Amino acid sequence: FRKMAFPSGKVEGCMVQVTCGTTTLNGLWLDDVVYCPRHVICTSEDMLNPNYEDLLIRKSNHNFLVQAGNVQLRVIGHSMQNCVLKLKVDTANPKTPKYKFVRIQPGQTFSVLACYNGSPSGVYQCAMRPNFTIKGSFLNGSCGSVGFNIDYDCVSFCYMHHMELPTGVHAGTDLEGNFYGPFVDRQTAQAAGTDTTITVNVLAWLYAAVINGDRWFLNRFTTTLNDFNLVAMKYNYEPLTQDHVDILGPLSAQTGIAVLDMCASLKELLQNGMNGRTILGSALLEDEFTPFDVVRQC
Amino acid sequence: RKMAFPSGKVEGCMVQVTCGTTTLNGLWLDDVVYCPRHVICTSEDMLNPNYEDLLIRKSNHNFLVQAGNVQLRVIGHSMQNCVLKLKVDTANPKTPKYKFVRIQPGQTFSVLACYNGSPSGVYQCAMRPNFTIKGSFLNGSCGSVGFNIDYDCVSFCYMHHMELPTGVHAGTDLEGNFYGPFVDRQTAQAAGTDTTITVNVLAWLYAAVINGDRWFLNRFTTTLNDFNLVAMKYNYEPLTQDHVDILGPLSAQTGIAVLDMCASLKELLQNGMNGRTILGSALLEDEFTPFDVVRQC
C-alpha cells in the first residue's frame, strides 16, 4: 500500500518566488494576489521580537521583488491577514485553478508541493499530527510551500509552511494566515506538544489490509468503547470518540467486522507487536491513512 | 519522506483509449498516442493472442482517443513491440521536452496513475530486482506511465501493463520492451524471488546519519567479500565497486567510509534493529537511491 499524493499540476502553475530584503521564499499566486508567509520582511534580527505592523508600514509597493519563472510581477498593493502577506499584483494569474481555502483538523491528510526559490522540487503526502505539526522534508527555502487536496477541478488549499521547530517538525498556517497549533511566526522556545498516534487512522488502515486480503491480526474478542480507550492511551494513541466510530461505519459494513471488534484487534496488536510479520508492507501501525483515503484507493 | 516529481508536465499528456470494451490510458506526444498493445484484445482474445494478426484486421475507427472532452480522430496505427502507436489528427499543445529512457533495477521513478485518462495521483517507486514493482493499482490503470524529470525534461521509463498474483505490477519501457520475464498474454506468470536493493539501504542509512540517527554505527569494518557472503544469505543483491564509488559523495559528507557503514548494516541484518527504528521505519527501506538521498539532503 502506497501513500499517494495529488497530481500537483494545478498547484505547480501558481508557485512564484518572492524576495524582500535579503530574504527569499515561495508565494502562492491566485487571481491578482500573491500569498506568502509574513516573515519575508523580518531581518531575522526582527525574528526574536518582530512588530509586523511596524515593519510593514515602512514598506513601499516597490519593496517587493516578485518573480514567476521568467517574468517580474509588479506589486500594486500590499496588506496582511493574520500571518499571511497578501500582495496585490498587476496581472491576474491565468493558470489560477479552481480553489477554496480550507482549514483542516488534525488527523486529516493532504499533499505538499515542496518548492525552492519558486521552483517546484517535489510532491509528497503527509498528515497533520494531533500536536499540530507536519512531519516532512523541508530544506531551508521551503517557506511558503502549500498543502492541498484536489477534488474535481477544485484545489482545497489547507496549509502554508512557515517554521521548522527544534523537534525537527514543521509548523504552518492555513491560507488565511492563522497558525495550526500554539505556534507563532517568532523565535520563542515553542516546542511541539507530545505527539500521539491517530487511532482512527490506524483502524482504517487495518480495514484496508483486510480488504486487500489479510486477516491474521483479527481475533475472537471485542471491546467496549471505554475499555479500548483506557488501553490505547497507554501507548500514546488518540482517544476514539463516537464520531470516530460513525466515520468508520462504511468500511465496517463492507467487510463484515464490527468497529469495536476491529478495536479488539488493535488491542492485541499493540500488546504483541507483529511477530516478524508485516501489514501492507509496514512493520509499524500506520496512522497517515484516513478513512476517506482508504475508501478511495481500495 | 518519499518524494515524487512535480506531475503537471505529465498530467497534460494523459488521454483515454477505448477499443471495444477495454478502456485504458494513453500518452499523447506530438500527434501520436502511446498505449499498451493489449487494448485490442478481449475476453477470449488474450488467452493466446496473435498480435500481428489482431491488428492487421482493425482500422482507425476501432480506437476512441479522448482528451477529456475533445475526441482526437485516429489517422494511423502501428506497433513497436508491445506499445501501440496511434497517429492522431491534432498535435498536443502541452507536449513537453522528453526522452524515452529505460531504467535499471533499483532505480526510482514517479508513477502518475490515472483512471480512464484522468489522473488519480502520483507516487514514488522503485524497479525491483525481479523487475516487478510494489504497491497497488487496479483495473483502469494500464497505460499510466513512469518518469523522472531532470531539467525541463521528462524522462519516461515505464508503462503499466499487467498485474500478477503477487499483488505487483509489470510493464514495458516506452518502446514496448518488457521489464522482466513477462508477456502481454493472460496465462500464469509469477515474480521470481525478489531481493533487497543493498546500495539503497546504505544510502538510506547515510540519510539517517545525515539527520542524527547515529546509533547503528559501530567502530568496525567488514570488507567486500565478507559482506557479500552475508548479502547472499539475507537475499540482498551483492555490493559492487561501482556501488561504492557511487556512495563516495555520502561517505565524504559523514566521515563514514562505505565499508564501515556495511558492518553497521550487517549487525542489523544479523541482530536486527533491536527495538529502535531508523527515521521511523522498522524496515531497512530500499526505495531511496543514493541520488534520491542527495537530491533531498
> CA of B295 to nearest chain A CA: how many angstroms apart?
9
> CA of B78 to nearest chain A CA: how many angstroms apart?
30
Question: Which CA distances in Å does B77 have to A264, B60, B84?
Answer: 57, 7, 7
B window 164-203, beta carbon within 8 A of A = 167
Tally of CB atoms within 10 A around A105: 9
Give backbone dihedrals phi and psi of B206, rounded to 5 degrees, phi first: -55, -50
CA separation for the pair A46, A48 (Å, rounded): 6
Helix crossing, A242-255 with A199-211: angle to 10°? 0
Task: Give the residue among A152, A105, A172 at the shortest CA–CA distance from A10.
Answer: A152
Cβ contact A180:A174 at 8 Å: yes
Task: Give the residue among A194, A293, A281 at the shortest CA–CA distance from A251.
Answer: A293
User: Is B120–A5 a contact, with Cβ atoms under 8 angstroms apart?
Assistant: no
Strands B153-164 and A15-20: unpaired
CATH number where A271 lies: 1.10.1840.10
| Identity of residue B40 | I
Cβ contact A95:A13 at 8 Å: yes
Task: Give the residue among A241, A210, A214 at the shortest CA–CA distance from A228.
Answer: A241
Question: What is the torsional sign of CA B174, B179, B181, B183?
Answer: negative
Strands A154-165 and A98-101: parallel
Half-sphere exposure of residue B284: CA atoms within 13 angstroms, side-chain side: 26
Task: Give the residue among A86, A84, A88 at the shortest CA–CA distance from A74.
Answer: A88
Number of CB pairs, chain A paired with chain B, less than 8 A apart = 88
The number of helix segments (H) and strand segments (E) in chain A equals: 7, 13
Cβ contact A211:B136 at 8 Å: no
A37: contact with B, CB 8 A cutoff: no
| Identity of residue B29 | L
Cβ contact A24:A17 at 8 Å: yes
Half-sphere exposure of residue A100: CA atoms within 13 angstroms, side-chain side: 10
Bridge partner residues of B76 (DSSP): B87
Grouping H, G, I as helix, E, B as strand and the rest as coil, residue A12 is helix
Cβ contact A208:A280 at 8 Å: yes
CA separation for the pair B123, B143 (Å, rounded): 15
Q: What are the helix (H) ranges across A115-214?
A: 199-211
- Within 8 A by CB and 6+ apart from B225, the residues are none
Cβ contact A155:A98 at 8 Å: yes
Question: Which CA distances in Å does B208 have to A287, B254, B285?
Answer: 22, 11, 11
Question: What is the torsional sign of CA B144, B148, B150, B156?
Answer: negative
Question: Which CA distances in Å does B275 have to A231, B64, B114?
Answer: 21, 55, 39
Strands B74-79 and A146-150: unpaired
Q: How far is CA A191 from the centre of its chain?
A: 18
User: Is B122–A3 a contact, with Cβ atoms under 8 angstroms apart?
Assistant: no
CA separation for the pair B60, B33 (Å, rounded): 12
| Identity of residue B70 | V
Q: Which three cell numbers stand for residue A101?
A: 481555502
Of B8, B280, B281, the CB nearest to A12: B8
CA separation for the pair A291, A106 (Å, rounded): 14
How many Å is the maximal CA-CA distance in chain A? 70
Cβ contact B198:B264 at 8 Å: no
Which residue in chain B is spatially nearest to A1 when comparing CA positions? B135
Which residue in chain B is spatially nearest to A14 when comparing CA positions? B8
Strands B70-72 and B74-79: unpaired
Residue B38 among the catalytic residues: yes
Half-sphere exposure of residue B208: CA atoms within 13 angstroms, side-chain side: 24
DSSP A201: H
User: Is B8–A6 a contact, with Cβ atoms under 8 angstroms apart?
Assistant: no
CA separation for the pair B248, B194 (Å, rounded): 27
Cβ contact B158:B111 at 8 Å: yes
**DSSP string over chain B:** ---BPP-HHHHTTEEEEEETTEEEEEEE-SSEEEEEGGGG--TTGGGS--HHHHHHH--GGG-EEEETTEEEPEEEEEESSSEEEEEESS--TTPPEEEE----TT-EEEEEEEETTEEEEEEEEE--TTS-B-S---GGGTT-EEEEESSSEEEEEEEEEEEETTTEEEEE-TTS-BSSS--SSSS--------B-HHHHHHHHHHHHHTT--SS--S----HHHHHHHHHHTTBPPP-HHHHHHTHHHHHTTS--HHHHHHHHHHHHHS--TT--BTTBSS------HHHHHHT-
Q: Which three cell numbers stand for residue A276?
A: 516478524
B window 5-24, beta carbon within 8 A of A = 5-9, 11-12
B window 204-223, beta carbon within 8 A of A = 211
CA separation for the pair B172, B161 (Å, rounded): 7
Grouping H, G, I as helix, E, B as strand and the rest as coil, residue A90 is coil
Bridge partner residues of B86 (DSSP): B33, B77
Domain of residue B287, residue span:
198-296
Task: Give the residue among B281, B120, B167, B286 at the shortest CA–CA distance from A286.
Answer: B281
Cβ contact A156:A97 at 8 Å: no
- For cell 491578482, the residue is A32
CA separation for the pair B29, B20 (Å, rounded): 23
Cβ contact B62:B19 at 8 Å: yes
Grouping H, G, I as helix, E, B as strand and the rest as coil, residue A135 is coil
Tally of CB atoms within 10 A around A231: 16
Length of chain A: 298
Of B8, B167, B211, the CB nearest to A13: B8
